[PDB]
Subunit: 369 residues, 2 copies
Amino acid sequence: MVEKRVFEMPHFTTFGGKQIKNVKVGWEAYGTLNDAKSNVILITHYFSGSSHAAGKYDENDPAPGYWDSIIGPGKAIDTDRFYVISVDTLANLNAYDPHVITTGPTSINPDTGKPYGLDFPVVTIRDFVNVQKALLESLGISKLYAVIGPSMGSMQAIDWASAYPGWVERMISVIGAGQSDAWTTAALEHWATPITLDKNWNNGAYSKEQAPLNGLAASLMLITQNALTPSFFNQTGNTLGYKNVESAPLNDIRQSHSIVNWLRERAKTRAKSMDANHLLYLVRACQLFVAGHQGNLEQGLASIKAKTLFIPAQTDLLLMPYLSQSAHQGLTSMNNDSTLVTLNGKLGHDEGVTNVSAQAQAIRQFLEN
Amino acid sequence: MVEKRVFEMPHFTTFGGKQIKNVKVGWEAYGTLNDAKSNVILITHYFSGSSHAAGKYDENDPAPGYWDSIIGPGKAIDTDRFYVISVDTLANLNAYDPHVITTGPTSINPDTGKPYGLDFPVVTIRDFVNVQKALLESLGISKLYAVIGPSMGSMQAIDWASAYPGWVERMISVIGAGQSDAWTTAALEHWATPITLDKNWNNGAYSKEQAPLNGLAASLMLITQNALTPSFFNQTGNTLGYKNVESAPLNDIRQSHSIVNWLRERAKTRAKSMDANHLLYLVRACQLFVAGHQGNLEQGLASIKAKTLFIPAQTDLLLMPYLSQSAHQGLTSMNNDSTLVTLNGKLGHDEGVTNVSAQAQAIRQFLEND
């Protein structure tokens, strides 16, 4: 059973040059730290994720952590050999989940007694990395056997390897990217605009009881679809009995197709404990991302000393495979020890979260020695 | 030049079983109708398009019609031989454009003296087809040498071939589809939601100078990107000097990246003469679309007699090539004379609107086969 832990810092300076007071983030760990503290693997989480990479907090949890299939005794990320640790990001999307601890727009400003809202400082991938670094230092750790993560987690992983080259021995990027290129930065903006259009957003100053729930659900509808595939939607439609000439949307401009109703309800269910401002801040962190946060991707790649493994999903429509190919080729041309293998299932981006065990052997082989 | 024309129907029955009075749509044509009226090619337009497929209304128009590269004397669709005609759809997105004539939510209901708004009946691809059919009948035309269109225009073209099989000798579908599958219907819904979130939308009842402008702009940002590619956005970013760690969005949550400022400005420029409700109605027409408007695609393909040509774009992220492959394979399995060729350019969906001449010869030889 996993114990959720909390890490606190009285003062923190962001990459943008601003102060955050009384940082608190959640974390958890699996396995045993060895005497040299040389067996640490840091898992960095995806956009809508948390530190809960494996295991259960309680027996009656319906599901274990999202990467339970590859984290455990004898698994590809072997907790019999490694101390596997993971940390909630700042501005964590799941701001109202009782198992998540974060700091961000929903945090109470002492000088006002209300949430910071959009008074909270802009956060970056680097800020998540630096909070993780401070936690590791508080545990006496000064090196990582590996850093591993999917999607926004792959961004944290490769930034670790570039920003702190002597800290990171191995870097695994899953359904990932070396930067948010202009395409990706524009693509993520569409996740933000529905929240900004919701009449309850009030420029970020909303109360929890009058939240922009419709805009947040609209954002999650787009996120949910972007991270999947036509095959998934069409098979879902088959189960629903979807067809084009459905009587309700033909007769009423305000009624929707079966597949749209399904997606709206799925998004509303996903969004139950999420916060809209936190979504906006995570969008902005991703838009500012390049490995190493120097002038361009080439500079960031040139700093990486870790050997690297990239695992794009062939059918990913969100962080498309070319982003992984770009980083892998850049590293290969710099004589970095870099490998790329592919997830080939039909869940698109979500292959890297729900079906990462399809490349468990590539991960296991990469972590051997 | 080109003269914009208007077609009026006093009474019109929709596919959904409702009445529209005083239907007016714009149209135009190029070339000469022969004595047998046997040389008619109908062009059906894409989601944000109009009847203006070729030529200029005024010499000082900054650009000709969107398919001018393939419609004209000696071009792939040869107006020395064919009479090439095109019709504005109902609920045309470009509701305030000085040349477009349409009927939709912005129109004045003669019964109330006031705009329909969301009182306008739901429209379908079939309704666009039936307005075109009525215009053609008013001109004494009773058969189409071909019907040709990109994207939403491909939907009109293949519905023509399915619903009125004897009317259609040839059907060209560009960057197209035989149905809006579950994926596509969900994808199009995201074009609608920003409008309905904007408080100014007022459940459809907004006035022209109090429109949901920022919701419409957000919709057009998503439409613009969905129809392009990473290559296009990244090349655009390079021209803008896009950088990852731009100082403005790092320092201020309310500032944006260069590429976002560019997209927002592009969207607002596109939307200047558009209407938000019309966008909602066109989304719904596309979501209701299957060729023939029967219960599935196979039933619609079964009635097609016309020979068919499909021209997907390899890099299309909006109507992906598998939609064209699905319709084409369904037709060849029924022993329809069907051909598929592919646009290979890097502009995605927009290949079919702005670069269709890359497959000009395939179109020409499909049409010129005596």
